[PDB]
Design a protein around this ligand. Structure first.
Ligand SMILES: N[C@@H](Cc1ccc(O)cc1)C(=O)O
Length: 295
């Protein structure tokens, strides 16, 4: 029986979706929990020390494979073991996180999928929902390398395309209230990168932003379900399913160190119709938009 450890940072929609897809891929390929695999699922509940203790225990348990969901969980798994294969998902920038040498040839015990998406995809939506906006706010966790890379990308785009960026770096969930509140009066739109801290506090961000008539564009649909206005993002269940197919390969003997990291080029526009209505906006004509209601 192959023993798989799954280390997930926290329940937020994107991370949950990757776990769902990964398990379905393994099952479709004949690997079934309680039969020829054992899945030990561990949630850190957003606690950074717990990402490290989960990973430590998976290494001392001698798991056959570790599936790590998010940058923090992956970094912890990599710190814990350089021998057990680690498959990642929902990692924005595996190279910047120190997990792989290159995407095409990791050269380490880590491979999997990246949730990289260009800032351009979300900022395209300004033409639709805030066509006169000139100042973009971004709140993010200064401890997440995934977020730092995306903020740099945002600033590069803004410098190219005539926008101002106002940053609010935080490190704790207790800072969210004053952080979003402080951006009121100073921004035309909020961009939410794939930041685990902010994604976990989206209902708060949404409530204050929407009361202040600030559109919030997120990088992916989880925050939209939790009260952001819109996104043009990837499908995280599919990303997880791809990672499970790569697991099948590793369980069957393929070398993780030569397995290329996979990404998705397929995005979909999803809008929260409740938030749209609260902002006094009309549904645009665009046939490719799908609508969600608040989770
Ligand atoms: N990209 C994040 C995970 C994440 C995904 C979706 C989000 O909305 C937020 C965070 C990481 O590298 O850890």
């Amino acid at each position: 029986v192959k023993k798989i450890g799954i280390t997930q940072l926290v329940e937020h929609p994107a991370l949950d979706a990757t776990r769902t897809g990964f398990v379905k891929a393994l099952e479709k390929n004949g690997f079934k929990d309680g039969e020829n695999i054992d899945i030990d699922f561990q949630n850190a509940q957003n606690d950074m020390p717990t990402t490290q203790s989960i990973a430590s225990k998976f290494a001392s348990d001698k798991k056959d494979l570790i599936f790590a969901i998010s940058t923090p969980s992956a970094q912890a798994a990599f710190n814990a073991t350089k021998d057990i294969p680690i498959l990642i998902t929902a990692v924005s920038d595996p190279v910047a996180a120190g997990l792989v040498k290159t995407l095409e040839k990791p050269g380490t015990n880590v491979s999997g999928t990246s949730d990289f998406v260009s800032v351009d995809k979300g900022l395209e939506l300004l033409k639709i929902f805030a066509p006169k906006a000139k100042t973009i706010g971004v709140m993010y966790n200064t401890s997440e390398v995934n977020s730092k890379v995306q903020v740099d990308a945002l600033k590069e785009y803004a410098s190219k395309n005539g926008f101002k960026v106002v940053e609010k770096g935080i490190t704790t969930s207790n800072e969210v209230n004053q952080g979003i509140s402080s951006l009121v009066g100073k921004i035309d739109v909020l961009y939410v990168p794939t930041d685990n801290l902010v994604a976990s506090s989206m209902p708060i961000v949404s409530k204050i932003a929407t009361e202040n008539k600030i559109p919030v564009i997120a990088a992916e649909s989880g925050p939209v379900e939790k009260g952001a206005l819109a996104c043009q993002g990837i499908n995280y269940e599919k990303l997880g399913y791809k990672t499970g197919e790569m697991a099948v390969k590793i369980l069957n003997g393929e070398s993780v160190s030569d397995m290329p990291v996979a990404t998705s080029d397929d995005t979909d526009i999803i809008v929260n119709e409740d938030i749209l209505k609260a902002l006094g906006m009309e549904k645009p004509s665009n046939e490719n938009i799908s609508y969600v209601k608040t989770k």
